[PDB]
């Protein structure tokens, strides 16, 4: 209608971590626009592999959010191929299955 749609809605990343995801995208591009940086990282995910997430997790722990190593790594893996079907690939029934 007349509102901007947050691109991360299509991804995982609970809405309580949109600010963290935006900051991670802005820092990976090594900028000094949140949405533009997010849209660029979504298409150039190779730049997220060089970012240090352990330092960010330590920063979060020192700020007062508790342990977030796994949460941040999950957000990074999400930026890389938003919602990737974790289900096992299709396989043809083997001999015993067919029998």
């Amino acid at each position: 209608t007349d509102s901007y749609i947050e691109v991360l809605d299509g991804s995982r990343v609970h809405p309580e971590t949109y600010e963290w995801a935006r900051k991670m995208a802005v820092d990976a591009l090594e900028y000094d626009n949140p949405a533009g940086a997010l849209e660029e990282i979504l298409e150039n995910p190779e730049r997220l592999k060089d970012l240090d997430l352990d330092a960010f997790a330590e920063e979060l722990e020192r700020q007062g959010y508790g342990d977030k190593h796994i949460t941040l790594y999950d957000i990074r893996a999400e930026l890389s191929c938003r919602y990737k079907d974790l289900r096992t690939a299709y396989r043809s029934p083997n001999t015993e299955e067919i029998f």
């Binding site: 820092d27 970012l51 240090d52």
Partner: peptide
Amino acid sequence: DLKEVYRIPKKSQTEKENTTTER
């Protein structure tokens, strides 16, 4: 000069060379 907010830094060369052997 000092109003710069925290910035998520990049990994060191040691980490970039070591962690690359894990997947």
